[PDB]
Every structure is written in C-alpha cells, then in structure tokens.
Amino acid sequence: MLIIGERINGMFGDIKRAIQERDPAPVQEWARRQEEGGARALDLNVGPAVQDKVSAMEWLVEVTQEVSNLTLCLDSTNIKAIEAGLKKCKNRAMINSTNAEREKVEKLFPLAVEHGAALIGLTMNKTGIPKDSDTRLAFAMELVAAADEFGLPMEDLYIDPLILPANVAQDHAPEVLKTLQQIKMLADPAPKTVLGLSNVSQNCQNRPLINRTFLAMAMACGLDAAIADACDEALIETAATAEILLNQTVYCDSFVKMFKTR
Amino acid sequence: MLIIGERINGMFGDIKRAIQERDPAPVQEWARRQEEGGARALDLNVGPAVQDKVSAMEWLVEVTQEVSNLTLCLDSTNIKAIEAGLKKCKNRAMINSTNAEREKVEKLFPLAVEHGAALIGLTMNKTGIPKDSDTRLAFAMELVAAADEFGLPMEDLYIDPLILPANVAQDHAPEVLKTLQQIKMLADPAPKTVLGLSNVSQNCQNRPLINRTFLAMAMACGLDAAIADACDEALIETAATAEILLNQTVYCDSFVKMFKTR
Ligand SMILES: CN1c2c(nc(N)[nH]c2=O)NC[C@@H]1CNc1ccc(C(=O)N[C@@H](CCC(=O)O)C(=O)O)cc1
Ligand SMILES: CN1c2c(nc(N)[nH]c2=O)NC[C@@H]1CNc1ccc(C(=O)N[C@@H](CCC(=O)O)C(=O)O)cc1
Ligand SMILES: [Ca+2]
Ligand SMILES: [Ca+2]
C-alpha cells in the first residue's frame, strides 16, 4: 500500500496562505511530518483560491523537493500547471489526474509517458460520476486501452473509481469496492488502483474510523494506493496490517514500524 | 454482521474453573458483558479439561439462558454433547459445527433441521484443512448441496473457511478472503459465512489491530458472522462501520451505538 500524503492541499487554510504569501515553512513542515508518518508520495494541490495556479504548482514542487525525495503527485485539473510542475520535479512524479474524456486522454497519457510519470485515471467523463460498478469498469477499461495505445506501462496507471461521502452517497461505497475487485482480476500486467480515501467520511462522525475501515476493505479488493492522512497513526497501522493479511508483506512482530521505515 | 461472543469457552481459565466447580456466576457475567458489547449470539464450549462433557454442555446452556435470551452457539465436536445441549435450549440455537466429512454431514444436518437450528460448516474433511481456496470452495459447495439435500434453509447455513494465525500460516489469510468472495457468488439464496476471528492473531503482536483489520476485509468479501471478542470495543466499531460502508445499514451519526443497541 502506497500512502500519498493529502495535506499539502490549497483547500487547507494554512496551505492557502503559504502559497499566497509564498511562505515555504508550512509546506516543508507538512512534507516532513507526512513522510515521518509513512507516506511515500505527496499530493500537491494549489487550491482554487490562488490566481496563478501554474506558478503556484511550480512553487509547491520546488519548495517540497528541497526537503523531501518522495514522489510528487501533481494534483490539478489545469494541464498547463501539471506540465509546468513536471518540468520542475527532480524525481519521478505522479499526474493527478486524467479522466476518460478522449480530449484529456490524448494529452495526459503522452505527457505521462514523456516524463516517465505515473498517471491516475478517474473512471468518468463529461457525463459525470457513474454509480453502477459496470459503468465505472467500462471507463477503467477505456483507460487501460489508452495505456496500451500511448505506450504507458500498465503498472504506471492508477485507476481511481472515485469514492464519495458515505453519509449522502452511501450506495456508492459498495460499488467502488466491486469496481476495484473487477480491476484486480485483470490479467498481467494489471493496472493499479488508488482512492481519495478521506472523501468517504466527509461530514461524517468519527472520520478516522470510517477512513480506516474503508481502507482495509479497499485493500482486500486490490487497492494499491491511497491519497490519505499520512499523519493519522491508526490509518498507517491499518495499511501495514492489511498488507500482512493479504500476504503482500511477510509477518514480523514489528510490522507497523517496518512499514513506516521501509 | 452477527457477532457471536467467543468468551464462554472452556479453554479460558475462568470458564474451566466455573464448569468444574459448577459456579454459574462467572459464566452469567460473561453472557451479560458480551451482549452489552453488541453480541447477538454466544458461543458455548466446555473445553477439553472437564470429564463429563455432555452434562457440562447442558449446564452451560442452562445457566446462560437463565440470564440471556441470545441465540446459543453450541461449540463441540461431541455429537452427544450437541444433542443434549439443543434439548436444553429454550431459544433457537446454532450448531458449531459439522465439517465436509459425509459421516458428519448426515448426522449434523438432520439434527439442525430437527431442532430448527442454524449450522456452522467447516470447509474441511478428514484429509485436513486445505490451504488453496479452490479446495476450500469445493467443500463449501458440498455443504451448500447438503443443506438442500436435508432441508436446511440456506440462510441457516454458515460456512467457515477456517482462518489460521497470520504469523505462521500467513498464506492462508488471502485464500480465506478469496473463498468468502467465491462463496457469495454461488447462487441465491446464498449461504452465510462465519469465522473464528481471534485465530487470525493467535501468538501475534497487536492482536486487536489484526483482528479488526481482518474483520473489515472479510466483510468486504461477504462475511456475515464472526465468533470474536464481543467486549473489544474497537472490534465492534469496525463491525458497525463496515455495515455502513457496504450499504447494509443506513448511515446515521450514532451508527456505532445503533449497532450495539440494535
Ligand atoms: C477529491 N479527492 C481526490 C483527489 N485525487 C484523486 N485522484 N481522487 C480523489 O478522490 N484529490 C483531492 C481529494 C483527496 N484529498 C483530500 C484532502 C483533504 C480532504 C478533507 O477531508 N479536507 C478537510 C478540509 C479541511 C480544511 O479545509 O481546513 C475537510 O473537512 O473537507 C479530503 C480529501
Ligand atoms: C477455533 N475457533 C473456531 C470455532 N468455531 C468455528 N466455527 N470456527 C473457528 O475458527 N470455535 C472455537 C474457536 C473460536 N474462539 C476462539 C476463542 C479464543 C481464542 C484465543 O485467542 N484464545 C487464547 C487462549 C487464552 C487463554 O487460554 O486464556 C489464545 O491466545 O490462544 C481464539 C478463538
Ligand atoms: Ca492491486
Ligand atoms: Ca454475505
């Protein structure tokens, strides 16, 4: 399980301010804390508030890689910002993300291949987020075909079935799990999967509990990565424990500590 | 998710003592504690120490139902002990258990049907516990077939893939999850599934964490019941949260208390 730190996101007050005033401190500290927690990748989202998002993404990348060697997951719907971000990265990055819209596919897949970056693909298009796991799957298969079309190593494709809040879109959770299990059955080389975990507990009571439980359930269905709270110690324990239970990582008494220091 | 309290088991020092000295107190206190924790069924095992195991089972049933209206899960390999127990039960019971051995099947299935009791079926026979999910599923199918043969309503059949310790039999864990998943894809009305959860963490470190993480994973694979620690609050939290994430129970802020006081 690859945990992608979610905290360096412009939606958070401290990050929004850091970006606006160009204060590196808050960002670099979150990069450190998330890595200490067990994250092996960092999501970088500039947020919708800043004016020049292209310039903001470059800044997030520069100040982050100064204190971290972790993989950078450039999170933005602005392709110019993604491209500008990729050019600043000193290490392999992740593009977050592309959807099944052909227009975006033929721009982001070649871009990912060009930079040898991983690519996250959302199971949806202009038509919206589908509920049925079969519709989600069809979009997943469109991304898979695209990976073969543009020469992207299937192992560099992370399909995101898009999890929603369990309190107002509860019937989506089981559909997401089913979509993951289906993608898991694909023949080798099979694509990977990822989720914006925290979205499942938005506005719910005891979000950490809900996040933890869904992560474990999702991993049983093949989940490979999760954009989540890397500073949540109980979440990290779950990830570590789940690997053991799927026999992905050999058991030893200090399996949690080994997960955080691998 | 049906939690079957595991604590009333002769392997535990206090229960062994209570049975041998015929002291109702310890047993009745555990019955109340487990129900308060959220269990809706109580496993009753006399343990191997006591000499007269048939009268010990009748005694456990008598002292337990005296303070509890919960379904009693009679845990014993001695058919006579099971029969004497069922005869003492004032409420519907559960038999734990029968295996895939035909000799066991033709005695236990008709027994469960005669008493209108539920029946737990282990995916194993005299050749042992199979590691591969293919063979586990094969025995599961024999159990489903026997249920139709002897007239046991399918929802009264709980198939147990038999989970083993994650530190010495780690490769069994994923095979169990796969079995559960395939069991749910046999035919509706499909049979139910159950596990002796605590076995997965035997001799491991961070036992509660391993137990609850696996429960969540198993529920995503269809687990319907579990013989576990009904007094472990974190375990109950997971059970309650999993139901929500599988859309089996409508979400509300008090979903945990709601599960317990259900
Ligand atoms: C849509 N999510 C998502 C994605 N990328 C992919 N591929 N998939 C996804 O589902 N990128 C962004 C987001 C994942 N990251 C996050 C980050 C924070 C919170 C969150 O819970 N935020 C707080 C905001 C706190 C504050 O603003 O002060 C919240 O309560 O909403 C949720 C998801
Ligand atoms: C084999 N398990 C099992 C079953 N029935 C079915 N159908 N399936 C099962 O897997 N019945 C008994 C047991 C389930 N109950 C239990 C009860 C306790 C412990 C346990 O962890 N015991 C302690 C012993 C503690 C003591 O002796 O004081 C241990 O660490 O082994 C595990 C499973
Ligand atoms: Ca996978
Ligand atoms: Ca089920």
UniProtKB/Swiss-Prot annotation, chains A, B:
Disulfide bonds: none
Pfam families found in the cross-reference section: Pterin_bind (PF00809)
Effect of N199A: 20-fold decreased affinity for methyltetrahydrofolate and nearly abolished catalytic activity
Class of the enzyme per the UniProt entry, highest EC level: transferase
GO BP, sorted A to Z: carbon fixation; homocysteine metabolic process; methylation; tetrahydrofolate metabolic process
Highest taxon above the source species: Bacteria
Site (Transition state stabilizer): N199
Claim: Cell membrane is one of the keywords in the record: no
Cofactor: Ca(2+)
Binding positions for Ca(2+) 2 per the UniProt entry: G222, D224
Catalysed reactions listed for this entry: methyl-Co(III)-[corrinoid Fe-S protein] + (6S)-5,6,7,8-tetrahydrofolate = Co(I)-[corrinoid Fe-S protein] + (6S)-5-methyl-5,6,7,8-tetrahydrofolate + H(+)
Function: Methyltransferase that mediates the transfer of a N5-methyl group of (6S)-methyltetrahydrofolate to the 5-methoxybenzimidazolylcobamide cofactor of a corrinoid/Fe-S protein (AcsC/AcsD) in the anaerobic acetyl-CoA pathway (Wood-Ljungdahl pathway) of carbon monoxide and carbon dioxide fixation.
Similarity comment: family membership: Belongs to the vitamin-B12 dependent methionine synthase family.
Entry protein name: 5-methyltetrahydrofolate:corrinoid/iron-sulfur protein co-methyltransferase
